[PDB]
């Protein structure tokens, strides 16, 4: 498998990247607190957004509205309009670093999670927190909405992945499954677009695959090969492949069915912090210690 890099920014450490679903843009959020908006077809910086002190780890566009959300070490979840370029409002509630923030695909909700050991769901019309999901015993490093069902999945340094039932919201927001398996903290978790599969990545240097049904969830298999903390992982949406990204300075591609290594891509000096896939193109982006890259595979 070959990597074809289409865009690269040279900057201080980047922590988050988000693809716009129809414009050729990415947002990048940096460890220095700044947010950039780049056109990856022209290769040019379009806008800068400054509304945080310290690192900004969470960043996401709304899937249809001209909004994006950012989440910071200053505990704020900020909502912005990219046409007016204004910071619209700041959602107050978290009491420690925000690790991830995303929009729901249908409801007017934002999800965020935090070192304060909570996941929060916010309604961006009323500007209120509508649920606080508690139960993790350490930082919650990641949370994601299920692509169709009223479920959330989260990953924590308490070494667990949890799946939450939020149908009551839509107790009420309650843990459905507590997935034990990682023997170290978990840094990331992700749902497959269509199948009942979860992927998680941890400080044990492993990527694990899990399967769920209505009544139960269990560990399927493990991708072994990273030699440092795995920061992020995702399902390739158009091939039976798993992608992972690690502080060992590699992006790895694995076979979804066999869990065997397919390809490794390596940078000489840069730890990887985050990877994402475009919602409608076969385009990927990674954030690392020296900026961001957008790339195709094969």
């Amino acid at each position: 498998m070959a990597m074809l890099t289409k865009f690269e920014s040279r900057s201080s450490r980047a922590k988050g990247v988000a693809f716009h679903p129809t414009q050729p843009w990415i947002l990048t959020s940096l460890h220095n607190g700044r947010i950039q908006l780049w056109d990856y077809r022209m290769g040019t910086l379009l806008d800068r957004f400054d509304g945080h002190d310290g690192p900004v780890r969470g960043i996401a566009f709304h899937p249809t509205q001209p909004i994006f959300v950012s989440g910071g070490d200053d505990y704020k979840v900020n909502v912005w309009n990219y046409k007016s370029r204004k910071l619209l409002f700041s959602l107050c509630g978290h009491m420690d670093y925000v690790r991830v923030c995303t929009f729901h695909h249908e409801y007017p909700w934002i999800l965020s999670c935090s070192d304060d050991q909570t996941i929060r769901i916010w309604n961006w019309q009323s500007r209120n927190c509508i649920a606080i999901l508690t139960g993790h015993s350490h930082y919650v490093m990641c949370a994601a909405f299920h692509p169709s069902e009223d479920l959330i999945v989260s990953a924590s340094l308490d070494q667990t992945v949890r799946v939450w039932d939020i149908s009551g919201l839509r107790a009420d927001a309650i843990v459905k499954f507590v997935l034990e398996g990682h023997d170290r903290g978990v840094n990331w978790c992700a749902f497959h677009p269509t199948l009942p599969l979860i992927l998680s990545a941890g400080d044990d240097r492993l990527v694990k695959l899990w399967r769920m049904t209505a009544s139960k969830a269990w560990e399927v298999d493990t991708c072994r090969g990273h030699f440092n903390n795995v920061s992020c992982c995702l399902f390739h949406p158009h091939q039976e492949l798993i992608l992972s990204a690690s502080e060992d300075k590699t992006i790895r591609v694995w076979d979804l069915n066999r869990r065997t290594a397919v390809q490794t891509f390596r940078r000489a000096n840069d730890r990887f912090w985050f990877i994402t896939v475009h919602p409608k193109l076969n385009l990927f982006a990674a954030a690392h210690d020296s900026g961001v890259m957008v790339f195709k595979l094969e």
């Binding site: 899937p63 692509p147 169709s148 677009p193 949406p237 919602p279 409608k280």
Partner: peptide, 11 residues
Amino acid sequence: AASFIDAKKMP
């Protein structure tokens, strides 16, 4: 089940 699969791939 996700937006692109439902709008583009399937119908």
